[PDB]
Design a protein around this ligand. Structure first.
Ligand SMILES: [Zn+2]
Ligand SMILES: [Zn+2]
Lengths: 96, 107, 217, 126, 97, 108
């Protein structure tokens, strides 16, 4: 009668993980955001396993990092040494 | 088993004869007397000690076996027949029992 | 001629009144109804499963209890008709318990490594005149690596009926009397050894009073 | 004789057709038992095969009517501050009383759904 | 006779739910020299370490507080057709009683 | 003493061994039946021919099917089986036809 379990649409699942830049808007002029995802020694872009971005927002980062090198907005071979103490969101091992 | 009964009795005849062989008046006489006599009775020159002649008590020369475990209408007596190595696994049970009632309280 | 006391307890229905050693309530409070993950369910636990709760498979306790009026009844008859009952598990967490329960009753245990060819090659492993078991009771149908036991095949190769505890990952197929229930829980198989022990020693003392009644009349 | 072929049938059917043949003379000691009180499923071998396509498993993911208000208590407040026991029968958690202080209110209490938490927000401290 | 579907609804495993970081009390049921085997109910046991705070208070039957992380400890790996249970739980000890 | 066995294949089969060089063994396949519905087959092998013969004759009576038949002569219905690559097509027929079938199926 009333007793048996119903079919409902699966509670106790918190809504899915919004990455870090989920509703935000990357620019090519927004160098201090873009310089956060390149390496402070080599200038190379950290990957999706490091940056923790979704594949949508990782690709807008890379399509705007490479947009900004040729326009004269950010340098290729290093992080902007002025913009070095920003919140280190990219997880990387070295010197623990 | 009636294969051992015909060799215990045949031994005590050959014990009683060997005291009647030699001059030893005690018809009850020691085994190292028997080991001494037959060596001096049957002189080998053989090199192995297990190749020289021996007449001994047959439980000590025939190897020992388990007896049969199934009586009539089957029913093997041990509660671990159907392992094989039937006494080892019980002797592993006697030890595992012997450790838990310790830890239930406290060459 | 001794076939008066063989052909009564096949006509009687639940002759040993085995429907008193359990209900769903005793089975609930010792956690029979819990099964493993929905990740490792089998195909043939599919009828026996109530559902999954947050991915934990829950075993039908109604469909459990309609097996055990029928599974414990048959292992009562195997104790009545004097057949050899072998207890097997490979749990290693109840391996003391199964063998100790085989001494508390009068039938058999084997909870150790399974030598290859224990039932299919018995006649050279033992003497040539061995009465092989007439029912095998499993308490873990799985092996210490998670595939079904050796003796679920060699039971059926040697044509022996078998009652087996089947849990959400086990294989119910070749064993004739599945018991869809828990086996990994220490309260569950204390219950399971309690019903299987008492159902045969009640079934043994039924066999004692009937032949004595026949001995007098 | 006997047959050792566990694929080709049940051990009943691999025996009750061997007594019709007359290859085993003695009637095995489980045969006249199993015939009388048989299992609800004949233990024929089947090879287990994998679902490949649009064939999900027909089990039901069980959910109960009181799961909503249970879910929100682990959202807006914490977990059980009181610890669990689960050894005693009928343990009533701080959520299990909270779902029962919800399920008197409806039926036909029916003020607003958020308000139905507002009425039971007050009552548990009292 | 009570129906199974009813007594599953009134069952404290069902009432718990998604077992992440949930305060559970449990019995200890086997002591090994360092490793504590806590039977909380459930299907399985769990194994903890013997802490340096009150390290003699953990005997057989000692009711202990548990965060009860995630009764699973199952995972499917790259070849597998089922998934590899370990028959454990990874519940972390907290205290006593 | 009411069964009889018939040989179905003798095959000089070979493997190759580090010391022995070439090694011959004999792979026999027998069929065993008794009339009356129960029949079975087995494969056994050894190096010697009499050794393989006894090995399969004394094994085939542990793997025997009950071949359920119609009244004594024929089978119940038409069957059409494909077995690994072998199509077999076998038909129910009326009494006194004869066994017009492959010479191995004759002896079974
Ligand atoms: Zn995103
Ligand atoms: Zn299990």
């Amino acid at each position: 009668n009333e007793d048996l379990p119903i079919s409902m649409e699966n509670p106790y699942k918190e809504p899915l993980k919004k990455c870090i830049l989920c509703g935000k808007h990357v620019d090519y002029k927004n160098v201090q955001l873009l310089s956060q995802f390149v390496s402070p020694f080599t200038g190379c872009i950290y990957g999706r396993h490091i940056t923790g971005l979704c594949g949508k927002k990782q690709k807008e980062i890379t399509k705007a990092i490479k947009r900004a090198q040729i326009m004269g907005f950010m340098p290729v071979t290093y992080k902007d040494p002025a913009y070095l103490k920003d919140p280190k969101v990219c997880n990387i091992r070295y010197r623990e | 088993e009636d294969f051992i009964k015909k060799q215990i009795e045949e031994f005590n005849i050959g014990k009683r004869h060997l005291a009647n062989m030699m001059g030893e008046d005690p018809e009850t006489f020691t085994q190292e007397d028997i080991d001494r006599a037959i060596a001096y009775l049957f002189p080998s020159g053989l090199f192995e000690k297990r190749a020289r002649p021996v007449m001994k008590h047959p439980e000590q020369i025939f190897p020992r076996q388990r007896a049969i475990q199934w009586g009539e209408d089957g029913r093997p007596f041990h509660y671990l027949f159907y392992t094989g190595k039937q006494s080892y696994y019980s002797l592993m049970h006697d030890v595992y029992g012997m450790l838990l009632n310790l830890e239930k309280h406290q060459r | 001629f001794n076939d008066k006391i063989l052909n009564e307890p096949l006509k009687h229905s639940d002759f040993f009144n085995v429907k008193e050693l359990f209900s769903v309530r005793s089975l609930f409070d010792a956690r029979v109804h819990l099964g493993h993950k929905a990740g490792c369910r089998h195909r043939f636990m599919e009828p026996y499963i109530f559902g999954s709760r947050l991915d934990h498979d829950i075993i039908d306790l109604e469909q459990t209890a309609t097996h055990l009026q029928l599974a414990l009844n048959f292992t009562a008859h195997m104790a009545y008709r004097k057949g050899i009952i072998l207890f097997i598990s490979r749990n290693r967490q109840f391996s003391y318990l199964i063998e100790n329960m085989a001494r508390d009753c009068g039938e058999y245990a084997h909870t150790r490594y399974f030598r290859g060819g224990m039932l299919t090659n018995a006649r050279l492993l033992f003497g040539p005149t061995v009465r092989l078991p007439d029912l095998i009771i499993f308490l873990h149908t799985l092996n210490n690596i998670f595939e079904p036991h050796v003796a679920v095949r060699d039971a059926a190769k040697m044509n022996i009926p078998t009652v087996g505890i089947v849990d959400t990952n086990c294989n119910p197929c070749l064993i004739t009397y599945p018991v869809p229930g828990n086996d990994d829980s220490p309260l569950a198989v204390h219950l399971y050894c309690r019903l299987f022990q008492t159902a045969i020693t009640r079934a043994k003392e039924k066999r004692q009073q009937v032949e004595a009644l026949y001995r007098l009349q | 004789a006997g047959s050792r072929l566990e694929t080709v049938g049940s051990i009943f059917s691999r025996t009750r057709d061997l007594v019709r043949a007359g290859v085993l003379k003695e009637k095995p000691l489980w045969f006249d038992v199993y015939d009388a009180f048989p299992p609800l499923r004949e233990p024929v071998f089947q090879r287990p095969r994998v679902r490949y396509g649009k064939a999900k498993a027909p089990i039901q993911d069980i959910w109960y009517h009181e799961d909503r208000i249970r879910a929100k208590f682990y959202s807006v407040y914490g977990s059980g501050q009181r610890a669990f026991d689960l050894f005693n029968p009928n343990f009533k958690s701080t959520c299990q009383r909270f779902v029962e202080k919800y399920t008197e209110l409806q039926k036909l209490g029916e003020t607003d759904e958020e308000k139905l938490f507002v009425e039971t927000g007050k009552a548990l401290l009292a | 006779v009570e129906s199974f579907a009813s007594m599953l609804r009134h069952s404290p495993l069902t009432q718990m739910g998604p077992a992440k970081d949930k305060l559970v009390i449990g019995r200890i049921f086997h002591i090994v020299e360092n490793d504590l085997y806590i039977d909380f109910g459930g299907k399985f046991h769990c194994v903890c370490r013997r802490p340096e705070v009150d390290g003699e208070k953990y005997q057989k039957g000692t009711r202990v507080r548990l965060r009860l992380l995630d009764l699973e400890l199952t995972s499917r790996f790259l070849g597998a057709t089922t998934d590899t249970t370990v028959l454990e739980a990874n519940a972390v000890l907290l205290g006593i009683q | 003493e009411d069964f009889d066995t018939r040989i179905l294949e003798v095959r000089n089969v070979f493997t190759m061994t580090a010391k022995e060089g070439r090694k011959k063994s004999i792979r026999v396949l027998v069929a065993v039946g008794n009339g009356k519905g129960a029949a079975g087959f087995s494969i056994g092998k050894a190096t010697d021919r009499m050794d393989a013969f006894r090995k399969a004759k004394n094994r085939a009576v542990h793997h025997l099917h009950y071949i359920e038949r119609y009244e004594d002569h024929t089978i119940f219905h038409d069957i059409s089986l494909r077995f690994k690559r072998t199509h077999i097509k076998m038909k129910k027929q009326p009494k006194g036809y004869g066994l017009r079938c492959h010479r191995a199926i004759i002896t079974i």
